[PDB]
Write a protein that binds this ligand. Structure first.
Ligand SMILES: *[C@@H]1O[C@H](CO)[C@@H](O[C@@H]2O[C@H](CO)[C@@H](O)[C@H](O)[C@H]2NC(C)=O)[C@H](O)[C@H]1NC(C)=O
Ligand SMILES: C/C(=C\CNc1ncnc2[nH]cnc12)CO
Ligand SMILES: C/C(=C\CNc1ncnc2[nH]cnc12)CO
Lengths: 540, 540
């Protein structure tokens, strides 16, 4: 035969091959390696997107890491000694535009931390799933929950109601609760708790939310900016023609003056040059690359698009550069220069904080995480079992108990490492489509994630317009769930429509879920009361 | 038999009954009256929503109708004579927040004009369709095109690139072109020009656009406001806790000062009291009323919800009042006091302006109007013919030629009266579902619209939170078209997703269409080139 067949037979007939049930499942070693390679190539975009999104949250640092600034920018603080010259003490506004250099350096260190944390949490989840559940499933920080954690629970640069550490405690407790309810068989009852239209359309809502993030500026390619009249219009002007906003006080004659302490925004309003930003068009080229690769069923479509946009942005003196001619850009380029690095999580690891348990926002975030993970993981795991043909007549696929326990454990470990909940990835289907049936697929994906480390300098240099199209296309793939809604029935269409449309518009997964569930409950009050009376016998 | 049967027989056997083919279509007079009544009850929400949306556009008046204001609001301009006191000449900013009282009085006069114009254009379109095409179809200002005309082509208070008069010229020429292409049988070829995913998903995009309008403040119930970080968050704080924004200049230390001439926004940013606006909750109650009425198949659901919210808002000293204790509110209440009035269009009639033909924005608006009307009217008319069983094996329904000519004529007449394009309403199906088969249904709807006049004082008093839920639910009904998209196919899902998501996010129907069509063309370039080469024989 051949050396490849020799290896396959040897591993299949060895103790480790019997542990993973290779012979019992009709695939021994090279199919597992290929399935893991395919799954990793399909899910590798997470290595960029998750760290970018979570770093936008600001990480663990506060105003305590903002450096005092001199009155005039021409004078560095160490030379800020003279007449009429004073250092400005940092306040909360130092976190936002214009961002304090100390806080800007935070986000870079935290982005390195979160790259490593994404890789490590994915590796640990993959290994636990492959060993304890023996399934060809890859686990990684959840794409939908990433944006919710960063921009809703914590907020851009920590502008939300819950701090980053408190949100990590929320994710830790959510993983513990998910593990507990899975261990007692109580997960399916809570899965049936959510209304069907809300459950089905939450995926479409999260997809629209992610796509909207991909069309913003600090998160994606631009193309959506501020409008004084409509609140949103066509952006994609160059960064040099974008301006910030501040709250003002009007009057009955027309006088308008600044509001002290108002939260100034990013450069979101275009004064001219619409549809002329070079980074928007580079992001569009990356979008086209990813879309053709998806159409052609080219595994690694998103990775190829991100890599193209990033490689174009790695040149140093262009208008699409990831390393602008600044101190922050020079430092980012210096880190990028070392192609490989062994970064150690110094900020986000063990950064849990249980201060917010008494706050209602903590429990809103906790419940949203819990139910997103419940519904998502149930649907994905059973879809993957159907793909692998592990589902029997009764509907169980053997290692499901340990599959859900492994997912909950991965969530807890990721919370400890400093990342949003980690979940089983639907992209695992690719590895299942390639013949992966045992846990060796997950071990292969874990080894690929291990190789993803040592390349933090290369992954920390990914600009927003590279994250960009991956977000928009993840939204596109998530929209396919709308077809399962009865749009001719208003009792299902109205709650489903509310769930889809509130997530991007209120910009919050939790608000979309609350609005959809509340509209469902209100619209079914009449039917429920009628049926209750009929049960009591009042009505026939 | 009975007097009703006597009337039915008499009319069916009379000359007018034979003109409308009553006997030939198995319905004589009372079925036509009931079908017209049902169609009117279903489509009567337009009498509020269209005038509200088009008045938000600012109408025909400019800064020329802004009154000069004194330096201090305590002094009326006529008493603005003294030391250090000067009248302020009005500029463009007088149109926006804080809105000049003269310009505020414009919008009220123009809203009366546009109520009358909506009613008159609907009446004329209905009569032309009933007589020249002899179909049970009701025509009225198009719901989708209303918002596009007001908030994109013209802009809130005329902040767009095309003036109101130039946009009316665009609608006039669009109606002329539609009539021309219909008269030469060239309409179906242009209908096949648009890609299938774009054509199908434009309806979902317009629905999302209308729903987003219904969740804004000057247009709907609130619940979506400005966010410095995310550009959109949960609004629905009271108007007393909302503040405006102005562009500012940042620096490298933190200094931020106002930008002279910047376009200040409305009260869109909530400083506190989220989810506490009484008008938001009144709008939610109206939404619940409309949603139950839709669920219960109660004709006139939207009218009932609008009427409830409006009647609650007609009380004078509440936080949800349509007549605040101001000069504008006192005048609005004085007009509302006269329950009936015969208003004469004094501003928007014959207000066409052909100055912008050389502008590219004029032609963008013209083409968007033309293709929205083409696709919409084709789909709706053929759906209505299928409902009425007027479609034969070949696919023609007899009066289709004159149906499309009547629609184009109605568009031209509405442009002359000062309203966005008028279209055949899908709500006509209700009248078709009630047995309406001849043009007497359209004549009945026209008579009901005639009765709608004489109630302009009653219709000009409808607040935003009443328009509100009707917009959101129109979006809900429009979303049902997504199920016709192959979401597993990326060449159809990506263009469809772009079309749906760009309309609310860029806040423009034209941009959604352009983005969707461009993405479709780009994603099919490879296939088209491959097939062209195969035709040339280069490839097998
Ligand atoms: C419009 O009226 C306001 C008062 O409501 C004027 O406010 C001035 O600007 C600030 C705010 O009080 C103070 O420094 C001035 O003393 C205010 N003056 C007065 C007379 O209130 C504002 O100046 C007025 N606008 C114009 C153009 O005169
Ligand atoms: C509802 C949740 C998604 C959370 N994360 C993921 N859940 C399932 N599969 C994935 N592939 C990439 N990310 C994910 C669906 O968006
Ligand atoms: C694509 C266009 C709609 C324009 N107006 C209308 N087009 C067709 N039926 C209707 N009923 C109410 N408004 C309309 C679909 O939103």
């Amino acid at each position: 035969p051949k050396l490849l067949n020799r290896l396959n037979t040897y591993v299949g007939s060895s103790r480790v091959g019997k542990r993973f049930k290779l012979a019992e499942r009709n695939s021994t070693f090279t199919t597992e390696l290929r399935a893991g390679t395919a799954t990793f190539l399909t899910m590798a975009y997470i290595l960029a997107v998750n760290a970018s999104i979570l770093s936008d949250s600001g990480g663990t640092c506060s105003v305590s890491d903002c450096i005092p600034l001199c009155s005039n920018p021409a004078i560095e603080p160490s030379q800020c000694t003279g007449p009429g010259l004073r250092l400005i003490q940092p306040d909360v506004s130092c976190k936002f535009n214009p961002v304090n250099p100390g806080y800007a350096a935070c986000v870079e260190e935290i982005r390195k931390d979160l790259i490593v944390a994404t890789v490590a949490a994915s590796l640990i989840g993959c290994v636990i799933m492959g060993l304890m559940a023996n399934l060809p499933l890859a686990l990684a920080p959840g794409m939908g929950t990433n944006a919710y954690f960063a921009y809703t629970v914590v907020g851009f640069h920590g502008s939300g109601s819950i701090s980053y550490r408190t949100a990590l405690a929320a994710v830790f407790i959510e993983g513990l609760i998910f593990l507990f309810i899975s261990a007692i068989g109580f997960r399916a009852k809570l899965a049936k708790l959510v209304p069907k239209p809300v459950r089905i359309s939450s995926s479409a809502g999260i997809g629209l939310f992610l796509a909207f993030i991909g069309l913003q500026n600090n998160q994606g390619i631009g193309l959506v900016g501020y409008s004084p009249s409509t609140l949103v219009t066509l952006a994609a002007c160059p960064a040099s023609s974008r301006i910030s906003l501040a709250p003002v006080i009007t009057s009955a004659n027309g006088t308008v003056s600044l509001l002290a302490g108002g939260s100034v925004s990013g450069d979101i309003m275009c004064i001219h040059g619409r549809m002329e930003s070079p980074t928007f068009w580079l992001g569009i080229v990356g979008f086209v690359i990813i879309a053709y690769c998806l159409v052609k069923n080219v595994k690694g479509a998103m990775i190829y698009g991100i890599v193209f946009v990033t490689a174009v942005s790695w040149f140093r003196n262009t208008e699409v550069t990831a390393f602008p001619n600044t101190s922050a850009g020079d430092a980012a380029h210096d880190y990028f220069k070392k192609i490989v690095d062994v970064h150690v999580i110094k900020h986000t690891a063990g950064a849990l904080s249980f201060s917010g348990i008494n706050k209602g926002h903590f429990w809103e975030a906790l419940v949203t995480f819990l139910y997103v993970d419940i519904l998502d993981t149930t649907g994905t795991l059973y879809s993957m079992a159907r793909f692998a043909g592990f589902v029997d007549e009764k509907g169980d696929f053997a290692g499901q108990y340990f599959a859900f326990m492994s997912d909950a454990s991965a969530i807890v470990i990721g919370s400890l490492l400093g990342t949003s909940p980690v979940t089983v990835f639907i992209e695992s289907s690719t590895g299942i489509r390639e013949g992966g049936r045992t846990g060796l697929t997950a071990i292969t994906v874990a080894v690929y994630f291990l190789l993803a480390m040592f390349f933090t300098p290369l992954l920390a240099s990914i600009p927003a317009w590279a994250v960009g199209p991956p977000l928009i296309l993840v939204g596109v793939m998530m929209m396919k769930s709308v077809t399962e809604i009865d749009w001719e029935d208003m009792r299902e269409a109205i709650p489903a429509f509310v769930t889809m449309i509130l997530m991007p518009l209120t910009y919050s997964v939790a608000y979309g879920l609350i609005g959809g569930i509340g509209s469902y409950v209100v619209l079914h009050l009449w039917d429920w009361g009628e049926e209750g009376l009929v049960k009591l016998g009042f009505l026939k």
